[PDB]
Design brief:
This is part of a larger assembly, with one copy of chain A (325 residues), two copies of chain B, one copy of chain C (336 residues) and one copy of chain E (153 residues).
Chain B (H helix, E strand, L loop, with lengths): L4 H4 L7 H10 L2 E8 L6 E11 L27 H12 L2 E8 L4 E6 L6
Chain C lengths: L2 E3 L6 H9 L8 H6 L4 E3 L5 E2 L2 H6 L4 H14 L1 H17 L2 E8 L30 H19 L1 H7 L1 H14 L11 H14 L11 E4 L2 E4 H8 L8 E3 L3 E2 L11 E5 L4 H5 L13 E5 L5 E8 L3 H17 L13 E2 L1
Antiparallel strand pairs in C: 1-2, 2-3, 4-11, 4-12, 5-6, 7-11, 8-11, 9-10
Helix pairs in contact in C: 6-9, 6-12, 7-9, 8-9
Chain E lengths: L4 H19 L4 H21 L1 H12 L19 H19 L16 H6 L3 H25 L4
The chains are: A alpha+beta (325), B alpha+beta (117), C alpha+beta (336), E mainly alpha (153).
């Protein structure tokens, strides 16, 4: 029964809610589902369209309705501090003012651990790799796709060796191919499933995954959304990114940002499609940079398709630097 | 011990065959057992089941009494009529124990005698 | 708006409707939850009798929790006298009593077949959450199994290769073919240990000399099998149920709600591909919040040392393994 | 049958009085009278626990007879010095029961035909059935059939004890309630309405003060002024009397149904068919059973147990305010009751 | 000649289980779901009452209450296997509690004039208790026959 301890720390406010919408707290079930999704996406490149094999290996690692999960995840210590922070891309409907909407959320920092345990070393390594990929390449909680809930590891104590912590942009980009190679080798050794079937992933996976970098900051206080006015001169990194997103000049589209090149709830069609771009914030050597993770897939959603070049032309317009690939 | 009109509402007359089925199968069957004290479980081979007549079952007997054969008897027990009053007084509204499962509280029955008109 | 219908008979339908609108006080939580189920109807033309659906008929979730706790708090005096009697029952036998607080959330009896598609172990009389002694005995036995497997995995496999091969064949027959897959791992070690403790208890005499470390003291395998008993010998330790102390039942709530939000449910059930569709359908299950104090008691029948060993092992089991549902997600964990 | 003692059983924890002779929808039912369905504990099962508990107290030398310790080893030696060691070896090897137990309950199965036991443990009948209610969380429910059967029990002990004064305590009870009516205290009746709710039904309240007070007095005489941990007056307002069929429906439906599973460590879920249902008597139920005492039929009895009266006080002093286990599931904390030894 | 009610119970249970087995022999999922629902139904009836169980069967069927006539339900007109199993279970239970094993049979049905859901709606608790006993007995018979002759999951 090997163990692995992860001491997380949120650099941006986390919006993770239980049954009570107003009260926000760290949830083991939500993060476990997120790790399941991240393992499916990260190992999707090794599987491609092999849905059945991916489902089999997922039911092996994380359990199913016929076998208990061999990975047990529990949050032990939570030094949280409930506070109020505004939504990234949601503004109130106030007459004239129309300021942001600030719900309760976990304050930045709030170092809380997260304990991993498993009876098999390989499954523990797989879970740790999926969780570290989730922590690095995205956030957890509400509005995670628009720069919220991202965390970084403050301490590590595990038995099974894992990938080293990146120190700059180049190491972070190389970590993608690293983790992909390690999970591919581990899966081929243990499960011995299909060896990288040649097909674009029908879902969000690492088969077509690109990492982008945009902007840099040195003070965390000037990172998240602070100014409630566009004309304000105290726009932070998140605020400046939102202002650039609002400018229709950068992205070339008929409807601009209001088209279906992003999350489904925009316009007449409600649907449930999320934004392929996963906006996040990463700190590299005490320097904070906006992480723009984009997942390209063969089909956007059953029923319609969209042009992916709008995202890439938008990234090139505001000078987003592609670190991977 | 209860008014008879209170139980008249719950008296059913069924056909002879249907009544026979009730008598054969509706009698209580109890699965008694004995347990080994040391092991704490049922002792090997210590399992036997019994059949019991259900409670609140009404049965009637018929005692026929003649003159006392033995002579040299007191005047208070002279004839059968004198003997009858002894049985009626000492047995009316009395509880007996017919059959034997007394140690486990089975067999108690209310007895109510009485001559006809 | 919404329309609420009750599948209960007449008269009681109106009375239950009054009860749910907080017009009339309710003292028994189990009764109102079970026999007075509200069938809340949303904009859809159906009456969903789910906990998520019945949550709608309140102002919000907080109102639901407050109403449930207020219904629970009315029975505080009767539950207090019942707890006093239960504690007096503990003192009769030479039992060991220890108290642990819910380190994380706890939910027992999530799987009982209820109309809400979920349930919770609520006392039939006072409507309070409790942990049945059967669950405590089972979790203690399984934690002992896990500790034994981790400590002496391959050794007992060498000692008992025949039964482990029989178990591998049994798994092979049930699981497709898998003629010689049989991964000799901790899962199979625990399986063969359980098979030894359930159907081959006589063979445990050879391994009775072995001892496993739990907490600070060591416990023999023979001691464990005497504690939990076998098909031919009754257990030597009585496992009583666990109840929350009534002192805290008035200050902090003893019940609270939790959320299940299964995204990608068609992917898990019907085999659809994952991705940003299959709009999740959430349902809720009741659970006692963290920090609630519980009282546990175990009584022996032959040796008090057996009782204290069982108490230590059960304390370790609740500390690490945990009891109730979602024990693989950190639920049902206790601490001193 | 010289003297009769009434034993009151109050279930602290759910009691599974096993039947093991039938199969139902909810498996593992409890032993009930066939023609009525009311949950009962047959005398043989109730006697066994009493005899087993008595053995431990004697074997550990804990029985206080005439406020004096009972050293069975010397008592058997003094009484039966001819085979004092021979009989001791029989009980040392568990082949025979100790001296006091054979006198009271009867000889062990080895010596079946030596004599008969001095105790006639009657069946335990249902007296108070806890039923959930809107106000007054659970109401102790009784039926006219139960009290009528209780009245006959008082007639039996009166005949045994030759005390007519005890044969008229409950003779003033005669109630004819319809199904929709009940006699209940104020704690159960809903405020502002002459109706009560007993876990599935709305019953109109019939007003007669003496019926509950008569029953309340009977229990007070039977089991003293302490109702197993609470004053009787505190529960006098929670007692409800319902119709015959209403009570039958409650006992056939309101009994605890507990789902139990067996978890195999190989998979981590419920095993193949490893789940079953067990039916339990609800907690806080009251059951009574008379304990008739006859003349001890053993030869050369000690002067401390020679007559029935000396047996009765020993039984009362050893089985009052004690806790016993009835039925199965002993190791999982089920079947525990608090017993009260009462004399009319 | 007289016929015991247990014979009618067994005949009805065998008829319905054989009917579902023959009609949906290819549908393994339908048979497994129906067996699970039949084994889980009595516990739901005991915990929440017969009327709550009957309404909860219709809740999954998406049909509304107060228009519940079992004769007007086509149990095969539901796409989902779970819906099919729930419709079959509800139809069998309601048919037993309303008509028994037929008019000519020994058991002519308890309610005998309307749907048992309406019977529970507007009738006294003694009658609903009798109906609950009848439903539990027929459910036990159906569960036995399903566990015997129907494919599990």
């Amino acid at each position: 029964m090997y163990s692995a301890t992860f001491t997380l720390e949120a650099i941006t406010p986390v919006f993770m809610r239980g049954a009570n919408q107003s009260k926000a707290e760290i949830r083991a079930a939500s993060i476990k589902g997120l790790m399941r999704w991240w393992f499916r996406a990260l190992s999707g490149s090794y599987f491609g369209n092999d849905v059945e094999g991916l489902r089999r290996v997922e039911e092996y690692v994380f359990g199913s309705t016929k076998r208990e999960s061999r990975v047990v995840v529990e949050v032990v210590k939570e030094h949280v501090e409930e506070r109020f922070c505004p939504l990234p891309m949601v503004w109130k409907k106030k007459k004239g003012v129309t300021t942001r909407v600030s719900q309760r959320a976990i304050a930045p920092g709030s170092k809380f651990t997260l304990l991993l345990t498993s009876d098999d070393e390989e499954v523990l390594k797989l879970a740790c790799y999926s969780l570290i990929g989730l922590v690095y390449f995205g956030g957890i909680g509400f509005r995670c796709s628009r720069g919220a809930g991202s965390l970084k590891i403050s301490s590590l104590k595990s038995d099974v060796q894992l990938i080293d912590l990146p120190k700059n942009k180049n190491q972070l980009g190389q970590m993608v191919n690293d983790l992909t190679v390690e999970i591919a080798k581990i899966l081929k050794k243990t499960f011995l499933c299909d060896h990288e079937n040649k097909n674009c992933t029908s879902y969000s996976s690492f088969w077509c995954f690109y990492l982008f970098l945009w902007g840099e900051k040195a003070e965390l206080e000037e990172v998240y959304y602070r100014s409630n006015n566009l004309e304000n001169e105290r726009l932070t990194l998140l605020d400046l990114f939102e202002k650039e997103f609002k400018n229709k000049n950068n992205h070339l589209s008929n409807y601009g940002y209001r088209d279906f090149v992003f999350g489904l709830p925009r316009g007449t069609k409600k649907d449930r499609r999320a934004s392929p771009i996963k906006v996040g914030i990463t700190e590299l050597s005490e320097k904070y940079h906006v992480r723009v993770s984009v997942f390209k897939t063969k089909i956007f959603k059953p029923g319609m398709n969209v042009k992916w070049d709008n995202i890439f032309v938008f990234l090139e317009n505001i000078g987003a630097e592609r670190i991977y690939p | 011990g209860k008014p008879i009109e209170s139980i008249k509402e719950r008296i059913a007359i069924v056909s002879d065959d249907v009544f026979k089925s009730f008598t054969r199968f509706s009698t209580e069957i109890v699965a008694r057992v004995r347990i080994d004290a040391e092991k704490g479980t049922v002792a090997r081979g210590g399992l036997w089941y019994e059949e019991f007549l259900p409670s609140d079952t009404l049965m009637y007997s018929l005692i026929a009494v003649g003159s006392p054969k033995k002579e040299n008897l007191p005047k208070e027990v002279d004839n059968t009529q004198k003997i009858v009053n002894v049985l009626k007084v000492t047995f009316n509204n009395a509880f007996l124990q017919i059959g034997g499962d007394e140690t486990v509280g089975k067999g108690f029955v209310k007895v109510r005698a009485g001559v006809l008109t | 708006n919404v329309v609420v219908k009750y599948p209960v008979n007449s008269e009681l339908a109106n009375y239950a409707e009054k009860f749910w609108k907080k017009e009339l006080a309710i003292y028994n939580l189990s009764l109102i939850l079970n026999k007075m189920t509200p069938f809340v109807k949303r904009r859809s033309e159906s009456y969903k009798s789910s906990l998520s659906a019945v949550k709608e008929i309140f102002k919000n979730v907080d109102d639901f929790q407050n109403f449930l706790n207020s219904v629970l708090r009315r029975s505080l005096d009767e539950y207090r006298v019942f707890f006093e009697n239960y504690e007096r029952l503990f003192n009769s036998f030479s039992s060991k009593i220890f108290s642990m607080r819910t380190k994380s959330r706890l939910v027992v009896g999530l799987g009982d077949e209820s109309v809400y598609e979920t349930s919770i172990r609520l006392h039939r009389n006072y409507g309070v959450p409790y942990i049945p002694g059967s669950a405590l005995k089972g979790v203690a036995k399984h934690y002992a199994f896990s500790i034994l497997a981790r400590e002496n995995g391959d050794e007992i496999l060498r000692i008992y290769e025949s039964v482990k091969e029989d178990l591998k064949a049994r798994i092979a027959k049930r699981d497709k073919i898998k003629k010689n897959d049989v991964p000799e791992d901790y899962y199979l070690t625990a399986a063969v240990i359980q098979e030894l403790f359930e159907k081959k208890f006589d063979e445990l005499g050879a391994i009775r000399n072995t001892r496993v470390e739990i907490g600070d003291t060591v416990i023999s395998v023979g001691d464990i099998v005497k504690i939990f008993g076998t098909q031919k010998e009754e257990g030597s330790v009585i496992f009583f149920d666990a109840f929350p102390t009534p002192e805290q039942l008035k200050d902090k709530p003893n019940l609270e709600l939790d959320i299940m939000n299964p995204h990608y449910q068609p992917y898990y059930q019907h085999g659809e591909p994952p991705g940003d569709w299959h709009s999740p359908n959430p349902i809720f299950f009741l659970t006692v919040p963290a920090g609630v104090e519980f009282t546990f008691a175990v009584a022996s029948r032959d040796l008090d040392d057996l009782a204290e060993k069982a108490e230590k092992l059960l304390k370790e089991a609740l500390k690490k393994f945990g009891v109730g549902a979602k024990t693989s997600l950190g639920y049902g964990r206790f601490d001193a | 049958f010289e003297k009769a003692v009434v034993f009151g059983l109050y279930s602290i924890t759910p009691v599974h009085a096993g039947s093991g002779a039938e199969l139902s929808v909810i498996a593992l039912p409890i032993q009930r009278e066939r023609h009525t369905g009311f949950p009962v504990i047959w005398g043989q099962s109730l006697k066994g626990v009493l005899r087993s508990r008595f053995r431990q107290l004697e074997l550990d030398e804990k029985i206080e007879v005439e406020s004096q310790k009972w050293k069975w080893k010397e008592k058997t030696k003094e009484v039966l010095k001819e085979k004092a060691d021979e009989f001791i070896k029989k009980v040392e090897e568990r082949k025979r029961d100790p001296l006091l137990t054979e006198i009271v309950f009867g000889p062990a199965t080895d010596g079946a035909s030596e004599h008969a036991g001095a105790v006639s443990v009657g069946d335990a009948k249902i007296l108070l059935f806890p039923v959930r209610s809107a106000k007054g969380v659970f109401a102790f429910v009784t039926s006219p059939i139960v009290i009528q059967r209780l009245k006959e029990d008082f007639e039996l002990v009166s005949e045994i004890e030759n005390d007519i004064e005890l044969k008229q305590i409950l003779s003033r009870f005669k109630v004819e309630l319809s199904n929709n009516e009940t006699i209940a205290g104020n704690a159960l009746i809903l405020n502002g309405e002459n109706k009560v709710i007993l876990e599935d039904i709305v019953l109109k309240v019939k007003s007669d003060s003496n019926v509950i007070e008569n029953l309340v007095e009977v229990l007070k005489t039977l089991f003293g002024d302490n109702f197993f941990g609470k004053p009787i007056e505190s529960i006098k307002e929670r007692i409800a009397i319902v119709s015959d069929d209403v009570f039958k429906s409650f006992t056939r439906f309101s009994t605890e149904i507990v789902a139990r599973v067996r978890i195999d460590a190989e998979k981590g879920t419920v095993a193949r068919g490893g789940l079953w249902y067990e039916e339990f008597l609800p907690s806080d139920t009251l059951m009574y059973s008379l304990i008739a005492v006859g003349s001890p039929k053993k030869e050369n009895l000690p002067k401390e147990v020679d007559n029935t009266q000396k047996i009765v006080n020993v039984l009362k002093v050893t089985f009052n305010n004690a806790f016993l286990q009835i039925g199965g599931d002993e190791t999982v904390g089920k079947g525990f009751v608090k017993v009260r030894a009462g004399v009319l | 000649d007289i016929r015991e009610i247990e014979q009618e119970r067994a005949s009805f249970a065998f008829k319905v289980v054989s009917d579902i087995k023959d009609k949906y022999s290819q549908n393994k999922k339908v048979q497994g779901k129906y067996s699970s629902y039949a084994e889980k139904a009595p516990t739901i009836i005991l915990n929440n009452g017969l009327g709550a169980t009957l309404a909860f069967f219709l809740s999954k069927l998406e049909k509304p209450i107060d228009d519940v006539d079992y004769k007007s339900i086509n149990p095969e007109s539901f796409g989902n296997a779970e819906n099919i199993a729930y419709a079959f279970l509800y139809k069998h239970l309601s048919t037993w509690l309303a008509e028994g094993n037929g008019k000519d049979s020994a058991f002519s049905g308890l309610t005998n004039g309307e749907d048992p859901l309406k019977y529970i709606m507007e009738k006294t608790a003694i009658d609903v208790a009798i109906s609950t006993e009848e439903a539990l007995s027929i459910l036990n018979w159906i569960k036995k026959f399903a566990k015997a002759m129907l494919e599990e999951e």
